[PDB]
Design a binder for this molecule. Structure first.
Ligand SMILES: On1ccc(C(F)(F)F)cc1=S
Ligand SMILES: [Zn+2]
Length: 257
C-alpha cells in the first residue's frame, strides 16, 4: 500500500490515486515574490478556547491528535473562508534531518517539519460528506524550525513513546492546540488537496508565514516513531512529506503586505 519509501512513495501514488496528477494538488512552493497581497482577505479567526482533544493515534504514516468535533467547539473562520470549519485533528510531516521535512516550501526553502490542523466545513454535516466537496476542508499549515523548544508541544512529544508503532493509540485529553500557534496569523492561501492519499481536492490551504521554533530534542523524538507495526522490522517514521507539485492554473494570495 502507499507510503514514503522507494517503492511506494510519492512518485508511485498516481497509479492508485490518479488525482495525484490533478489540477489542484498539494503541497506547492510558495514563491513570495509572486504571491500577490489580497486586501479583500479577512483576518483569520482561530477559536480554539473550547477545543476538546480526545486521543493520539499512530496511523502508520504520521500521528493524529484527534478532537471531539460533535459540537462547534474549535473553529476556523474568516481569512479566505466562507462559513465555519470545525477542527477534527492535527498532525505533522517531518524529515530525517533538520534541513528537510516540510511539505510547502517558501522560495524553495524546506523547513524541518510542518503542522497541519485539519478542519471541515460544517455546511456539509460531517467530515465524510465534506471531503466530497471542493470547499469541504480548510487546513492551517504551520512550519517548524529547530531552535528554542516549544513548551506547548512537549505534552505531545512526551506521549510518543506510548504510540511508537502503527495502530497504537493513547488517551490524549485536555490538550490545548493554542500552544502550537506562532504570534502572527499572516498567511498565504491557495486551493489544493490532501497531501496524502487519497489526495482529495477539497482543501483551502492557509499557510502561516511565521514558523514556530521547536528544539532539536523535540524533533528527534518525532523521528523515533515507527511506520511499522508492533513486532515488525523497525522503519523509522521520518521523511513523511510529499514534495512540491506543479502550481498549474492557480494563484497564491498573501494576507499581508
Ligand atoms: O496529511 N494529511 C492527512 C490526512 C488529512 C485529512 F484531511 F484527511 F484529514 C489531511 C492531511 S494534510
Ligand atoms: Zn498533512
Amino acid at each position: 500500500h502507499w507510503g514514503y519509501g522507494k517503492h511506494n512513495g510519492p512518485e508511485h501514488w498516481h497509479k492508485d490515486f490518479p488525482i495525484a496528477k490533478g489540477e489542484r494538488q498539494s503541497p506547492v512552493d510558495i514563491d513570495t515574490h509572486t504571491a500577490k497581497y489580497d486586501p479583500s482577505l479577512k483576518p483569520l479567526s482561530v477559536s480554539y478556547d473550547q477545543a476538546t482533544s480526545l486521543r493520539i493515534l499512530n496511523n502508520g504514516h504520521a500521528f493524529n491528535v484527534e478532537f471531539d468535533d460533535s459540537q462547534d467547539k474549535a473553529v476556523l473562520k474568516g481569512g479566505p473562508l466562507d462559513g465555519t470549519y470545525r477542527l477534527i485533528q492535527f498532525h505533522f510531516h517531518w524529515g530525517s534531518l533538520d534541513g528537510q521535512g516540510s511539505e510547502h516550501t517558501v522560495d524553495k526553502k524546506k523547513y524541518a517539519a510542518e503542522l497541519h490542523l485539519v478542519h471541515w466545513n460544517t455546511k456539509y454535516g460531517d467530515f465524510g460528506k465534506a471531503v466530497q466537496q471542493p470547499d469541504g476542508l480548510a487546513v492551517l499549515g504551520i512550519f517548524l524550525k529547530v531552535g528554542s523548544a516549544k513548551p506547548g508541544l512537549q505534552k505531545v512529544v512526551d506521549v510518543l513513546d506510548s504510540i511508537k508503532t502503527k495502530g497504537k493509540s493513547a488517551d490524549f485529553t485536555n490538550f490545548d492546540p493554542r500552544g502550537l500557534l506562532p504570534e502572527s496569523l499572516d498567511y498565504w492561501t491557495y486551493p489544493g488537496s490532501l497531501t496524502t492519499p487519497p489526495l482529495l481536492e477539497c482543501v483551502t490551504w492557509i499557510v502561516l508565514k511565521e514558523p514556530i521554533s521547536v528544539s532539536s530534542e523535540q524533533v528527534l523524538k518525532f523521528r523515533k516513531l515507527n511506520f511499522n507495526g508492533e513486532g515488525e522490522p523497525e522503519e523509522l517514521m521520518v521523511d513523511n512529506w510529499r514534495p512540491a507539485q506543479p502550481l498549474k492554473n492557480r494563484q497564491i494570495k498573501a494576507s499581508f503586505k
